[PDB]
Structures are given as C-alpha cells and as structure tokens.
Paper text:
Immature retroviruses are built by the Gag polyprotein; Gag is then cut into domains, and the resulting CA capsid proteins form the mature capsid, which can mediate infection of a new cell. Murine leukemia virus (MLV), the prototypic member of the γ-retroviruses, is commonly used in comparative studies and as a basis for retroviral vector design. The CA domain and immediate downstream residues mediate protein interactions in the immature shell, and, following proteolytic cleavage, CA forms the mature viral capsid. In this study, we have determined the structure of the truncated MLV CA-CTD by X-ray crystallography and have resolved the architecture and CA lattice structures of immature and mature MLV particles by cryo-ET and subtomogram averaging.
No structure of the MLV CA C-terminal domain (CA-CTD) has been determined to date, and the detailed protein interactions in the immature and mature CA lattice of MLV are not known. The structure of the truncated MLV CA-CTD was determined at 1.89-Å resolution by single-wavelength anomalous diffraction (SAD). The crystal belonged to the space group P3121 with one CA-CTDΔCAH dimer in the asymmetric unit. As expected, the overall fold of the MLV CA-CTD is very similar to that observed for other retroviruses (e.g., HIV-1). The dimerization interface includes helix 9, as previously shown for other retroviruses. A short helical turn was found in the MLV CA-CTD between helices 10 and 11 (red) that is not conserved between genera and that contributes to the dimerization interface. We refer to this helix as helix 310b. We compared the arrangement of the monomers in our mature lattice model with the monomer arrangements in the crystal structures of the CA-NTD hexamer and the CA-CTD dimer (present study), respectively. The structures were essentially identical, indicating that the oligomeric forms present in the crystal structures are representative of the arrangement in the mature virus.
Numbering used by the authors:
A (entry chain A), B (entry chain B): 1 to 87
Amino acid sequence: SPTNLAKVKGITQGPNESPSAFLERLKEAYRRYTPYDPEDPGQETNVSMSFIWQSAPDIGRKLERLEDLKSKTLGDLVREAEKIFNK
Amino acid sequence: SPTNLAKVKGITQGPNESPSAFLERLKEAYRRYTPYDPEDPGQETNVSMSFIWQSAPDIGRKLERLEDLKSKTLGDLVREAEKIFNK
Ligand SMILES: [Co+2]
C-alpha cells in the first residue's frame, strides 16, 4: 500500500491483547504502509517509540518510566510490558 | 526532564510556522523529554517520522508521497517541506 503514516499511528493495543501480539500487528502496519522495515536495526528506536506510545495506557506509562529506558531493546520492552500485562 | 513522549507528540507545526522553525521545536522536545538525541544519526528515521506526521497536514501528505521516501534524509524532508511552504 502507498505510504500512510496514520495507519501506523492507528495500531493501538487492545484491552485483552498481549504485548507481543500487539507488536506483531504494529510491525505489520509498518510493512504495509511505510517504506521502513520494522526489523531493521536502524528502525528499532522508531518502532520502540510507537510501541511505547500506542501500548495500553497503564503499560505505556510504566514503560516510559523504566530506568535506563534508552538501553531497552524492542525485546526488552515487550518483556517489561508482559510483566505489567500478566501480573 | 523525565521522559514524556506526549510532549514530543504535542509538537505540531503552527499554521504560519515555517518547517525549519517547527523542526527546531521538535528537536528541542526530543532533547528535553526523551533519552533519544535528535542529532544522533541513529535517531534520524525516528525524528523524520515525527516530522512528517506532525507537519501541517498539507505538507505531511505531500512528504508521504515523495518518490524514494526511504532514502530522504531529515535535511531532504525539511527542504521539500520548505519548498511547499514557500509556494
Ligand atoms: Co505498501
């Protein structure tokens, strides 16, 4: 599909949706509606920021407060979100 | 300031504001409210996405449609935005 950033911003984690399932849906939107490959090392911070911003609000607020946030990989962020999601 | 992604999302080009002045404010928000340095080359596609998304909608829609958008530098996007802004 032709580039449409709104489609990427429109991927929001559902109330029952696991962080890893949400991340896969977010990556699919990057693939379909941007020229950026969400698996590229150069895109990690970009996907990470969308992941944090568009996670369910309780999760997003906690991910944003992680210590040494800059050091967190996309995999780290998913694991931290899962801790909040699973309790 | 402590990380606060809403402040980055809240930087939007003003109705009469030049693209270059808007990008300066967007970079300032990245510096103040994220751990991501907007002058780090590793962050350029991240700042570029925010710039397209948060530009005035007429400009952002045109930037989305640039041929070979993936190869545009942040400096390229600003120049093309300035070309649109100045008629
Ligand atoms: Co496509």
